[PDB]
Each structure stands twice: as structure tokens, then as C-alpha cells.
Amino acid sequence: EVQLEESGGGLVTPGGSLRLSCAASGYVFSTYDMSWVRQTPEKRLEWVAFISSGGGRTSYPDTVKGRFTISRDDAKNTLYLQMSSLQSEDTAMYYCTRHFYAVLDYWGRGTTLTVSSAKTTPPSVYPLAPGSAAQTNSMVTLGCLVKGYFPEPVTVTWNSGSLSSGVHTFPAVLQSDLYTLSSSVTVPSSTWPSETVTCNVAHPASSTKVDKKIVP
């Protein structure tokens, strides 16, 4: 059972250095050529480095030439990516893959790298109330705008976990070096505003928690 496992990513600041590891198992690691590839936040895949069986050839795209260095340790079944001069466009999930006779068949699970100078920052939480008695239906949708935090993630719950059907929490966007995301819930018209609906936002990197009550 072929397995590739990357690790070593986390948060660094521009100008920093870091070594990612890709540990292989379940096949004879020394026979194959390998590559590292990253998937960016815009969701594109970019090839980043290549090393052949034996280590005699390595090759890189011009954007990381001179900064990244791939190498391999056959005795430990592990592929490395030495990164220096990191820049914020290096923020991505990094994956190792093997060249199985020119077929990129097995890919690892990937490790996240965020390169940013932002400081740890708790979010501000604002309520999203219909802002109209034009209530489409007998269902009313409400929300929480979770703005300006760093880094990810945040977890959103409603009424402390008691309200869980009809919740959509969207992927976060990057607005000016900080993240923003929204979560919404749709409830029956007779629930609100008779009953209370609060969004509970937890931000683990800053150990902060915010509870926002949504009022008409």
C-alpha cells in the first residue's frame, strides 16, 4: 500500500526559511523520480521541484530557482524541500508525488504553508439580519459576518450547537491581509424573533470567543 506523507508546514514570515518533509512507505523509494507540487489558495496547481532517482538531476521553475532546494534521503525513504527567502506568493498546500514510469500516480495528503506578516488578530462579529419585513417565506435566513481575523481557522456554531440544521458557513476570503467569512442559518418564521438566535464564534489562535445575538 503506497503512502506519501508530507509535514513541516505552518506559519512563517516573509524572508523566512523552512524545510518540508515527504515520507514514503510501501514501495522501493529509491527507484523513482519525484516531484513537489503546490496548490495555491486560488486553487491552481504549480510544479515546484523535481529530483531524479539517484539525486543527480534536480530542476525548478524560475519562480523558486535559487530559493528552494529539493533533496532526498534514500536511507530514510524521505523527500525534502528546503525553502528559503519565503514570500507571501509561496502560501500554498505542498504535495509530494512520485513518477511511476512518467505517471504521477500517488500523491501525499499535503501540508499547509502560510507566509504572512499579519499578526494574530481576533475577529469582529457583526450580525446579518434580513433588513426587511419582506421575509420571502415562512423561513427566515440570518447570519454572522466574521471579519478581520488571522490566522485561520474560526469555528462558528449557532445557539451553542442546538441549532444545526440549515447552517452554511462559507469559505473565508482574504481582505487586506486578514480573513473574513460568513455563516448563515435558516429558521422557521415563528422562531425569530420570538426566540433568540446567537452565533458563537471561536478563534483558537487568539483564544478568543464572541457571542452575537441577532435582533430584528
Binding site: 491552481r44 496547481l45 469582529s124 434580513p130 433588513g131 452554511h168 460568513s182
Partner: protein, 210 residues
Amino acid sequence: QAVVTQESALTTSPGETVTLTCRSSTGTVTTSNYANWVQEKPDHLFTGLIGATNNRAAGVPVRFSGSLIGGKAALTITGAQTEDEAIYFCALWYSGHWVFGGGTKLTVLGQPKSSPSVTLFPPSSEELETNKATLVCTITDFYPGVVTVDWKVDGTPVTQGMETTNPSKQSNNKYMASSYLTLTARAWERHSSYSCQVTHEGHTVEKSLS
């Protein structure tokens, strides 16, 4: 170096045959480009399907095939199945360098088409106090997973200050997305009408606020 381009999105139905293509800007794809096709499924799970133009990997269903067609590499799925809805990337080998395409979002109709449910929210009093105003347009329950969102302020199309998330898959396999219009609280007080328009499968759902 080369620019690699693939169809952005395709829609097929289960049991049919779809073909996805990959072209180089360099001119013509060849056997010595060892075209590869990698599948991406939800939760960033990558699987190599085809490499060396037409060599299928082990365990990959037989309905996937690779070939070169009119100067391009191609992937055909004969008998597309429901679990095939996913993103497909191609990579071309340039004497030591891999160059990947943008990836095609392939939909395999596994449920009736479903129109987006759109909700447009006004900025709150508490964010106004900070001299900023965020308009949030939430779009859910749509299938297929591709939408287009346009904003208008007083009937004029907005060209900056907006950010839309990429469609993400819901529990029920329909998709959702968010869009944001970021203004200053002065700007919010100077305009009367705000509109969020969502275009899905030829139909436009619009939500406006005054």
C-alpha cells in the same frame, strides 16, 4: 515557458462520453510531453489517472483514456459515472519541467438542476459605527456548481470592491457561495439602490436593497 489551457467547465450526464482537452501555447502537444491527467476530489485528494499520454494508472477504472487529438492531449471518459464529478488537471512535461493547466470542473448530473437560493444582507449598525459597510449576498443550494455574480449600485455595474467565493459543496451535494461588496459608510449613505444578481444556467436571480 508554455501556458497550458483546458476547458474551464463541462457538464455531462451519467453513461455518456465526454472529452476534455489540454493545449499548449507552444503549439503542439506531443508524446515527449508525457501528458498526465490528475483528478482532484473533495478534501484536496489527488489521484493520478493517466500518465505518459495514454498509460492508465493501477486501480483507475477502464472508462478513463488518454490520447492526442488535433495537436492537444485529451482525456475521454466513456460511460461517465456520478462519482466522476470532480476537477481534472493536465500537466505537460517540458524537458525537465512540469507545467500544469488550470483544471476543468466536470459536472455529472447526479440530481435535478437546482436554482440558487439568494439572500442579500444590509450592513449592520455596529459595522457602520466603524465607518465601513459590508453587503453580503449568500447563494446556496445550486446545482450544477457554477454561478456568475454581478453587483449594481444605483443601476451601474460595480467593478471594484467585490469578492466572491469559489463554489463549495454542501452536505446534500448542491453547492454554495458567498459574495461581498465592501464600501465606506459614506459611500453606503450616498447611494440608494444595491443589487446582487446571480446568473445560474441561463437564469438570473436578483436581490436588491434600498
